[model samples]
Target chain A: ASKRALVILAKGAEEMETVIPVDVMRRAGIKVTVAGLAGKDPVQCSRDVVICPDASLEDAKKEGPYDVVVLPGGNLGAQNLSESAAVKEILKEQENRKGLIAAICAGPTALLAHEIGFGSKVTTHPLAKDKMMNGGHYTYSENRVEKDGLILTSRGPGTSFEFALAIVEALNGKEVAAQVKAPLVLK
Target chain B: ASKRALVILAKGAEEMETVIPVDVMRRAGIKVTVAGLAGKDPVQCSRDVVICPDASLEDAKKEGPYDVVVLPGGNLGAQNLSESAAVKEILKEQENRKGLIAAICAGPTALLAHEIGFGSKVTTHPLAKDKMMNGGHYTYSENRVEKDGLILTSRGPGTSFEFALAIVEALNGKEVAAQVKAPLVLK
Candidate 1:
């Protein structure tokens, strides 16, 4: 079976954080789908790059038994994404399906806001630790990436490569991820 | 007189690459103005955060005698920004005035594309060295920020703090820039 990943994009999504991982994953031969919230227009990334979704949240919610659901962070985008019922529902369903649900930077705040992790540890943008703490979760400040079973999270744009590598490791095994990292001299 | 700095928001701008400098510069008490091309909507940052401009390029062209113009980079943003006529005009004027023009990562491509450097040695995102050479400029491969007269540039996002600090030094003097760097634990 072909591996499929869902990337949820919103207005103000960090351009590098969103694109690098998507590009890297796709380069690794994973099928990546960009999805948007219901009634939301095509999302604009940093620097005015506009990206229309491959599917809407409403459609994705109904159709997904996806391998992973990835959320890219922008403060406003995270807020908008967290407010979408379809996204929250998909996240909830992923828990039972054992499918991955990953978020980066402030994107993980949406997961915290939606109460998706329940008792699991999480990480996000450094500035958001207070909010994460208040939301009843364990948080850490680290570079590279972190994975708590099906929920993977990372820091900001600086860690995009490592984050994508982590996802590649999860999907295609560590060997493939290592191979990609080697050419870039990324440890 | 208040110092005015111009920040270019174009497609694929690295989120942290732009934000870290903006935040650091604001903390240093600089007056920064974000300028986008005519007819473009507000620029979205990395992480999907939207940043509306204080003025449009049309207005900037008419009113700008800005002290410095700073271009933050992502591959696509730099490519698009390099092709913007208004941006080229502003760069030309800044060069004529001997005002500072700083670029980071792929941003230096804009400077190269517009033929703003003449024969000046410059630095850019490491991946861009070949492209910079093709654009007819000497490339520096060092990770440190390079200040070739009033044209400041650096390798990539890892040097965002260094890049911002260099701008501060150029605008506010070395002492003030040092003070700002101290607080951020940056050298």
Candidate 2:
């Protein structure tokens, strides 16, 4: 069965963080849904690039039980994700189901806000470390990409490729991840 | 003076290649205009990421004489770039003015098709090498990011950061490029 990934796209999200994972996962043959956090409208990213989501979060939530839930970050984007009761519900459910939840940059702060993935080793953009560690809920790793159990986390845009490939390896397997990576010309 | 960049976006363009450079350049304080080759509507990228361009190429061209021009790549996107008379005029004018013109992945094929940077050392996605060298018009190199005079090129999505930073260094200087690169968390 094809693995499905739900990427929550919010206004002020880091466009590089969002797009890199979505594109890379699609290349790895995952069925990725770029779901708009604000509904099926154009999302204005941190850098001002606009992305049209494949579906609204409300609608996509109905098609539940995705293999992974991806959260991309910019400060405001993470703040938005953290403040959403709907996002809180989804993260709690996904955690209960033991599904993978992946986030990058300021994204892991949402995990702190939602009180999910506590005690899992995680990594976030250097500047976001303080925010993600508000209550020292999760042990932090400095690894570019860190996965402890079903919680996968990574640093900022520079590590996005590695972060996404980790998700590919998690869902599809190492062979598929390697096969998809070669053509990307990563160093 | 703040430098300006024009990124020509076509349908089937690699979303990562397009977004990374645009976001990075903006972070470097470059005014980047994402111009739709077709029009100002949302473009469907190679991997199904839909991006709404900042403006149409026709409108953006009227405002340039930009400091740099960027071309992103996907096979069909580069083919669209290679086949466009509008792109030919822009590249030629940029060449005539000795302004920086950067391309990545399959994008350099457009330079080959338009005869814009003939004899300049360049690089492209390995898969695009033969197509870009069909007539032996330019020297090919394997450097992840290759810059020769005003012509700059890079490999694929993985090298997009290096490619964009190179452009930033060219236009803004090493200091600004370094400053922008730090937050990205690149390897």
Candidate 3:
């Protein structure tokens, strides 16, 4: 069976971060589902880019137990994700299964919202530091991409490629990750 | 008036390359239109990410004389762009006015198809070099992002930020570019 990924997208999401993971994960031969948080409607991203997701979260949830659940962040996007009962359930179930959960930028802030990983090492955009540390839950790191066991976190749009490639490495392997990274012209 | 950008989005386009420029350019306050090549429809990108374009090329072409026209590359996407008569007219008209025309990855190959800029120094993904250099029309460079006056090009996905930032710098000045870059958490 092939590896599967679920990318949760919402209005105000970072289009770059959202697209990078979807694109690169597919490149690594992972079956990635870009699930719209707000039904099946087109998602309006932070910079006004609209993304049409593969399925609605309601529908995709039925196809559950993805290898990883990806979260891309914009300020409001994170807030939306954090507010969702569906998202909270997804995160909690994935956590219980010990499956990988990757979030980038304000994405990790959503993890903080759902209380997915209490003591995991994680990172977020510098501006999001205070918010993620609100409860002094997770140890913070300034690294580009930080992985504490099944929880993976990264910074902002600039770190999206590293974030996506790290997800690829986790689901696939280092060799597959390097092979996919080379063509991307990533530094 | 705000600077306007026209980003041509086509089926099979690289989602990362397309979204990065659009997001970053909008960050710099450029009014970016992600115009669909084949009317107002969701474009399925090379990696299967679907992007809902802002408008159709036919409609956007009439509203043109934009500050810049951006081309994001995927092999099939560039081919689609290169083969389109509407795109040819847009590029030719933009070039005739000496307006900024930016492309990345295999996107520079579209210039060859439309005969937009000849003898301008540009760069493309290494895999696209042979196709871009087929007619010996333009000078090639190894720089991550190459800006030879109005014709700006970049290497590939990894270079997308530099490529997009270069476009921002061209339209909105260095201060604006740097300001936009800071929030993106780019290195």
Candidate 4:
């Protein structure tokens, strides 16, 4: 069966982080759902790019037990994710089930807020580092992309491809990941 | 004065390419309009990401001339661009006025179809090289991003930041471009 990924989208999400992972996962043949945090209306991202998601999280969650749950970041986006009870429940379930949970930039901060992955090593956008380490629940790393067990984290927008490829490697494999990476012409 | 960019969005367009430039340009404080090539409606991108365009190209063209006109790439999207008389006129007028015209991946093929920039050095996704070179109308370079006078071209999704930064540099100067690049966390 094809692997599935659920990317949670919010009003202030970083557009690059959101698009790169969704695009790259689709490139790797992963069934990806861009689930909006709000209703089905177009999402206004941090930089003001509006994205029309595949479905609202309320609708997408019924179909999930997803292989991986992706979180993209911006301050408000992470706050939105951190504040959602639905997101908290999903992360808790995914963690209990040992499913992969990937977050980029300030996205990982939500992991801290949700109390998921208490001891995993993680990384986030520099500006988000202090927030992610507020209680030192997870060890921090400076690596562009860091994966510790089922929790994967990365830095800012520039690291989105690397962050996504790591998810591809985890769910698909290095071979499938490389196949998708080649055409992208990544340096 | 703020720089303005017009990005033409069409069905089957590479969502990554389309969103990256628009987002990056907005990050640099450029006024960007994602105009629908078909009409003022949602555009279904190549990888199935839906984008609600800011306006119809028919309406945006009347508001120009913009500082830069961005063309994103997907095989079908480029074909649609190639077949559009409106796109041809826009590129031609932008070229005639010496305003910057940018394209990526299969996008530069539209330059050929429109006969907008002849004999300028250009680059495209490796798979697109043959088609872009069909008549030897332009000099081909393998550099990730290529610029010759007013025409700027780039490779694929991997080079999107580079492509977008180049556009920002052209419109706003190196200082502004560098400032934008730093926050993006690019290597």
- B65-171 in candidate 3: lDDT tens per residue? 89999999999999999999999999999999989999999999999999989999989999999999998899889999999999999999999999999999999
lDDT of 2 by residue, B1-187 (tens): 8899999999999999999999999999999999999998999999999999999999999999999999999999999999999999999999999899999999999999999888999999999999999989999999999999999999999999999999999999999999998888988
Which residue pairs in candidate 4 have backbone atoms (N, alpha carbon, C) closer than 3 angstroms, thus clashing?
none
lDDT, model 2, position A144:
99
Model 3 segments beyond 4 Å from truth? none
lDDT of 4 at A109: 92
After TM-score superposition, the amount by which residue A36's alpha carbon in candidate 3 deviates from its true location, in angstroms, is 1.1
Query: What's model 2's TM-score?
Result: 0.99
For residues A1-187, could you state the per-residue lDDT of candidate 4 as single tens digits? 8999999999899998999999999999999999999977899999888899999999999998999999999889999999999999999999999999999999999999999999999999999999999977889999999999999999998888899999999999999999999999888
Evaluated at residue B106, the lDDT of candidate 3 is 96
Question: For residues A111-143, what per-residue lDDT tens digits would candidate 2 score against the true structure?
Answer: 999999899999999999998987889998999
Q: Which has the better DockQ: candidate 2, or candidate 3?
A: 2
Pairs with backbone N, CA or C atoms under 3 Å apart (clashes), candidate 3: none
RMSD of 2: 0.6
Candidate 4 residue-wise lDDT, B1-187, digit = tens: 9999999998889989998999889989999999999999999999998889999999999999999999999999999999999999999999999999999999999999999899999999999999999989999999999999999999999999999999999999999999999878887
- Per-candidate clashes, comma-separated: 13, 0, 0, 0
**Clash count (model 2, backbone only):** 0
**Which should have the higher lDDT, number 2 or number 4?**
2
- Please give, for residues A1-187, the per-residue lDDT of candidate 3 as tens digits: 7899999999999999999999899999999999999999999999998888899999999998899999999999999999999999999999999899999999999999999899999999999999999989999999999999999999999999999999999999999999999999987
